[PDB]
Amino acid sequence: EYKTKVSRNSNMSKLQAGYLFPEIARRRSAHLLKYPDAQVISLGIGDTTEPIPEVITSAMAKKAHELSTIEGYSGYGAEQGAKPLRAAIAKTFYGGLGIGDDDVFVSDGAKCDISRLQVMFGSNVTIAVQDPSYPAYVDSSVIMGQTGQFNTDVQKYGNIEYMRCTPENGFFPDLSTVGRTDIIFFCSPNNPTGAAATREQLTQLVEFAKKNGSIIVYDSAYAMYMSDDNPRSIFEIPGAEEVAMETASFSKYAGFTGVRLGWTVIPKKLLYSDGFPVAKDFNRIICTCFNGASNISQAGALACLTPEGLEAMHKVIGFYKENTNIIIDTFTSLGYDVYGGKNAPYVWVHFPNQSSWDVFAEILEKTHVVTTPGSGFGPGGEGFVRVSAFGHRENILEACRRFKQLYKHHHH
Amino acid sequence: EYKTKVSRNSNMSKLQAGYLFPEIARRRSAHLLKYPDAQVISLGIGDTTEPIPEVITSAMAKKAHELSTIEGYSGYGAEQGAKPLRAAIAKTFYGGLGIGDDDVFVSDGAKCDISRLQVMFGSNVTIAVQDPSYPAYVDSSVIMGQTGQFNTDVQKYGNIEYMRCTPENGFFPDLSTVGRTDIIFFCSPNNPTGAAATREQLTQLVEFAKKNGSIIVYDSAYAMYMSDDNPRSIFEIPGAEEVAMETASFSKYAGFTGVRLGWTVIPKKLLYSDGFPVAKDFNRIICTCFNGASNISQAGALACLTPEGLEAMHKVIGFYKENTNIIIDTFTSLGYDVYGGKNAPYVWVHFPNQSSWDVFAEILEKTHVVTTPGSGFGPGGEGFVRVSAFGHRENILEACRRFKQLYKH
């Protein structure tokens, strides 16, 4: 067969076999061949299941129709995002935090902006991540050339600082043990652990980054599930404006898909070592990778940031939080150590003395419930399984009675 | 003031000041400060002006409504695009060309598709581009670290193969003069010249890529404007399946902004030097950045690929082609060499012995019309201006009468 003489990107080659998302899809389909009649319940991926509130879809449909009229029509979009959306985001979520409308960069998605940020930072930065955390940070880092090879003895890529977050340290790293890196990806409430950093912890984090001359990329995607009295934004910490940016996903904030839209806030005081403002480079990257967020999505996002939209968001969030309580009580009554769930829509269940892939396989085999193995979120996730609260109420209740059948004889 | 210790990405430092889009933006804003009441007509950046046809927006609104119902509610897209959309694209645009549904990767957009491909290829490939061409190819290469610094004597980044396309060669390069690269970005119809490569020309391009062991990235964004009888897809050339992929933006194909949707076709027989299939790395990539193109955009796109949707598209395209002819006739009647306009919704006008930024500036100052300076499309663009045909008919007519009045005597 013919082959080009183009070398495969050696950073693609670095990636380990059996990435979380394609692996779960494999096992789930293998499972359905095995049990063609199984009623499978998915509590894997943070994948939301309830209809978009009508207030938002009406706004989107209205914008849709308007795009077929003259005066109601508009061509492309402002590349940083429509000014009214950037304004509404700055005021609704960052009012009093010293954030201007022009510090907010709107994108078509949040996972999209991890990527754009990684292209911007480039191949020669080093990164720290929570261990465990969402696998996209690590993966984007490998792909950009920021890492060494995977080491299968420690299950880590070389040159990434994995900051261990455990029950014994209250799921916040011991910073006195963390090596300096250029970038610190920090997600609060964290996926998968559900842990939300306290004000005192985020103060330590900002002080650490200041001393090390690092940039924190703070992912507040799940901040709307906060129940404990903890900061929702890194910019609530004085000094964060010299060392941090913040990224969030509308879909995760609103508790529903359909508004395909994220943002990144980069403050004026965040500077590279030569004094150049980081925001100017991000803006420059948006002028090559982008044209604008979709105007129908923008119309929905704008509808969200109103009394009626905030009320619909709160209600949806409240529904998933009651789903989480059902799951917590199920595992707690079964005798397990259950973490998270308070400030996020998933629970992080400790299964000590089994590999998380084995637990995942056993739960799927025996109950037809899909969960997510902890080791999918890095080596610090080994020992745990994440269970998502995203599903119809009936499905959550049915999954929990199946857990109860499965695990009844495990504990006393 | 405090600064972090993080070194700026030297690939960002490489980029020249005054990138096309930011620059026009600065100049347009400054013009409105100077003249708040100016009736500005924009014939700059390819951005469409007419209402999206009702057949498409109705489908989008219907999908929006359904997402509020239990029975209609879906959310996360298939990461490579929903199968029904992939199948409709493959059949509608690639039927008979040996392209399967699984060869089509649907994304939210085409400008970022260039970006995603370039992350996939990585920092160690070399590229060739048409000169002039749409500046995102070069820009994406610089950003990914594929290049040297910008050289001001030649107005080029180091290590990019700029393939000279001129009136004198019909805007197709002399491939015997083109150095070998890993990647060849090739746009037909070309933005900004409007030139559509012939079957014989694309045959030469495939043979060249085959002997060089290169990958062609063929950008067919404007192929629905083709009037001459030229291939619309690189895959019409036998053997392209071994050396080429194709990329396109739904907005450019359909002739209307609103369906924020693109695709890339990567055939099974396109392999890296170690035998690994390029499509597999693309797939792995879109499963780290992306999640899917919106359910609503996919519904609009699905609606375009029907008899009624194709009819609406054809109508909108025909409108813009008439806009183009008005512009061509205007500049021709004024005695300028005018290129393009036949196979694409813009015209490429030669302004000899003058800088394209100065011509742009003069036209904007005197007529309040925004054009695009040719030098924004690389050094081969110097001495030309592109004028877009996207606008209401009355705006095109008004712009042309300003041009005629300015340039008559």
For the four alpha carbons of B336, B342, B347 and B349, in that order, the dihedral sign comes to: negative
Task: Judge whether A349 and A337 are in contact, CB under 8 Å.
Answer: yes
Running DSSP on this structure, what letter comes out for residue B398?
H
Per CATH, the number for B9-49+306-409 is 3.90.1150.10
Question: Which structure tokens are listed for B111?
Answer: 């400008």
Using an 8 Å CB-CB cutoff, list chain B residues near A294. 108, 260, 294, 296-297
Pair type for strands B369-370 and B346-350: unpaired
3-class secondary structure, A51: coil
| B 20-39 residues inside an 8 A Cβ radius of A | 21-22
B265 closest CA partner among B298, B236, B289 = B236
Task: Identify the CA nearest to A251 among candidates A295, A294, A304.
Answer: A304
Q: How many angstroms separate the CA atoms of A146 and A11, rounded?
A: 9
Angle, helices B393-407/B356-367, rounded to nearest 10 degrees: 110
What is the distance in angstroms between the Cα of B219 and the nearest Cα belonging to chain A? 16
Look at A8 and B53 and tell me if their CB atoms are within 8 Å.
Answer: no
Is B1 within 8 Å of A271 when comparing Cβ atoms?
yes
Taking CB atoms and an 8 Å cutoff, what residues of chain B touch A210?
2
What residue of A is the nearest CA neighbor of B271?
A: A3
d(CA B115, CA B257): 20
Residue A372 tokens read as 């997510």
Taking the CA of residue B283 and the nearest CA in chain A, the distance in Å comes to 11
Nearest chain B residue to A291 by CA distance is B111
Taking a contact as any Cβ pair under 8 Å apart, which residues of chain B between 362 and 381 contact chain A?
none
Number of residues in chain A: 412
Shortest Cα–Cα distance, A67 to chain B (Å): 6
d(CA A102, CA A234) in angstroms, rounded, equals 18
Which chain B positions have a beta carbon within 8 Å of A65's beta carbon? 57-58, 61
Cα–Cα distance for residue pair A222/A224, rounded to 1 Å: 6
- Residue B227 C-alpha from the chain's centroid: 18
Judging contacts by C-beta atoms under 8 Å, the chain B residues touching residue A296 are 60, 64, 258, 294, 296-297
Instruction: Using a CB–CB cutoff of 8 Å, tell me whether A123 touches chain B.
Output: yes
**Alpha-carbon span B258 to B264, nearest angstrom:** 19
What angle do helix axes B295-304 and B307-333 make, rounded to 10 degrees?
A: 80
The 10 Å Cβ neighbour count of residue B242 is 18
Q: What is the DSSP letter of A319?
A: H
Identity of residue A112: C
Give strand pairing partners of A150.
A157
Q: How many angstroms separate the CA atoms of B161 and B177, rounded?
A: 10
Enumerate the β-bridge partners of residue B104.
B265
Tokens linked to A72: 């109601």
Contact A325, A144 (CB under 8 A): no
Domain A9-49+306-412: CATH class, spelled out: alpha beta
Alpha carbon distance B103, B269 (integer Å): 10
A273–B3 CB contact, under 8 Å: yes
Q: Which of A75, A182, A291 sits opposite B6 (nearest CB)?
A: A182
CA distances, A250 to each of A87, A257, A319, B147 (Å)? 15, 8, 18, 36
Which residue matches tokens 């599903």?
A391
* B355 vs A16: CA distance, rounded Å: 52
Task: Kindly give, in sequence order, each residue whose CB lies less than 8 Å from that of residue B96, ignoring residues fewer than 6 positions away.
Answer: none
CB contacts under 8 A, A 95-114 vs B, are 108-109, 111-112, 114
- Per DSSP, the three-state class of B291 is coil
Report strand pairing: A338-340 vs A127-131. unpaired
Q: Does domain B50-305 have CATH number 3.40.640.10?
A: yes
Instruction: Indicate the burial class of B151 (C-beta count within 10 angstroms; 0-12, 13-18, 19 or more).
Output: exposed
Q: What is the nearest CA distance from A164 to chain B, expressed in angstroms? A: 23
If one counts every other C-beta atom within 10 angstroms of the C-beta of residue B383, the result is 17
Q: Measure the CA–CA gap between B59 and A293, rounded to whole angstroms.
A: 20
Q: Are B218 and B246 in contact (CB under 8 A)?
A: yes
| B250 closest CA partner among B86, B127, B378, B393 | B86
In the 8-state DSSP scheme, what is residue B217?
Answer: E
Chain A interface includes B394 (CB < 8 A): no
Residue A245: beta bridge partners? Answer: A217
**CB < 8 Å to B75, chain A:** 47-49, 251, 256-258
Q: Which helix (H) or strand (E) holds A402?
A: helix A393-407
Query: HSE (CB half, 13 Å, CA atoms) of B127?
Result: 30
Minimum Cα–Cα distance from B60: chain A residue: A64
Residue A353 CB-density burial (10 A; 0-12 exposed, 13-18 middle, 19+ buried): exposed
Q: Is there a contact between A389 and A52 (Cβ–Cβ < 8 Å)?
A: no
Nearest CA in chain A to B71: A51
In a mutational test of the A interface, the residue from B9, B16, B211, B214 whose CB has the highest number of chain A CBs within 10 Å is B9
Q: Exposed, middle or buried, B63 (CB in 10 Å: 0-12/13-18/19+)?
A: buried
Q: Which of B112, B122, B288 sits opposite A140 (nearest CB)?
A: B288
Contact state of B272 with A122 under an 8 Å Cβ cutoff: no
What secondary structure does DSSP assign to A73-133, as a single string?
Answer: ---S--TT--HHHHHHHHHHHHTTTT--GGGEEEES-HHHHHHHHHHHH-TT--EEEEES-
A286 alpha-carbon distance from chain centroid: 21
> B215 near A4, Cβ under 8 Å?
yes
The verdict on a CB contact (< 8 Å) between B57 and A64 is yes
Q: Does A70 touch chain B (CB under 8 A)?
A: yes
Reading the block at residue A186, the tokens are 């920090």
Residues of B in contact with A15 (CB under 8 A): 284
Characterize B84-115 residue by residue with b for buried, 16 or more Cβ atoms within 10 angstroms of its Cβ, and e for exposed: ebbbbbbeebbeebebebebbbbbbbbbbbbb
Q: Does A245 touch chain B (CB under 8 A)?
A: no
B9–A258 CB contact, under 8 Å: no
Nearest of B191, B312, B178 to residue B256 by alpha carbon: B312
Q: Environment class of residue B284 by beta-carbon count within 10 Å: exposed (0-12), middle (13-18) or buried (19+)?
A: middle
Cβ-proximal residues to B97 (8 Å cutoff; 6+ apart), any chain: B233, B235, B236
Distance (Å, rounded) from C-alpha A120 to C-alpha A136? 16
- Retrieve residue B204's tokens: 């030469």
Task: Provide the shortest C-alpha distance from residue A304 to chain B (in Å).
Answer: 14
- Amino acid residing at B2: Y
Q: In A278-354, where does DSSP find H-type helix? A: 278-289, 295-304, 307-333
Q: Residue B360 annotated as binding? A: no
3-class DSSP state of B218 = strand
Question: Is the CA virtual torsion A279, A285, A287, A290 positive or negative?
Answer: negative
Q: Which of B47, B210, B243 sits opposite A75 (nearest CB)?
A: B47
* Coil, helix or strand at residue A170: coil
Beta carbons of A83 and B56 less than 8 angstroms apart: no
Give the angle A131-A136-A140 at the CA atoms, nearest 5°.
110
Query: Token pair 């700059």 is at which residue?
Result: B44
Task: Flag whether residue B57 sits within 8 Å of chain A, measured between CB atoms.
Answer: yes
Instruction: Number of helices (H) and strands (E) in chain B: give both, helices first.
Output: 13, 15
Domain ranges of chain B: 9-49+306-409, 50-305
Answer yes or no: is B260 a known binding residue.
yes
Peptide bond just before B189 cis, omega within 30 deg: yes
Phi first, then psi: give them for residue A355, nearest 5 degrees.
Answer: -70, 140
Contacts of B212 in chain A (CB under 8 A): 5
Q: Which stretches does DSSP call E strand in A195-296?
A: 215-219, 244-249, 262-265
Best of B296, B320, B370, B392 to substitute, by most chain A Cβ atoms within 10 angstroms, is B296
Contact (CB, 8 A) for B352 and B388: no
Q: Amino acid identity of A356?
A: S
